[PDB]
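Exercise 7. Predict the structure of Thiol-disulfide oxidoreductase resA from Bacillus subtilis.
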Amino acid sequence: SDAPNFVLEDTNGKRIELSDLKGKGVFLNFWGTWCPHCKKEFPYMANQYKHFKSQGVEIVAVNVGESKIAVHNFMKSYGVNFPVVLDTDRQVLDAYDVSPLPTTFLINPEGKVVKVVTGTMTESMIHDYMNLIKPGETSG
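Solution. The predicted structure, encoded as tokens:
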């Protein structure tokens, strides 16, 4: 049930450790630039993140070991506005035993995996999933 801890660099070179996000809900995505689901769902995530960032939900979109350039090109094409990290050796992918691409893990403020999602997600499902993990209620 507990999300394995990991440390990866984001696309700006910043160290991101999962446990440094305790107290927040984490929408943890594993994805590749070629994935039909990701091309569709990344824009929905980016629109939802505009609302949920200020409700204590963080997104960590773990790319499965593709190049910096391929990742950058995808992020620009799909308007990504949330943290993307590079699982350069697929170590984290292996720790989470991820099969289909993509896979999403809903992690609560305590670091517990509350749902694993491999199906297609509408923007509404993404909204409800972020609600499922946000730390209580935050005032406007």
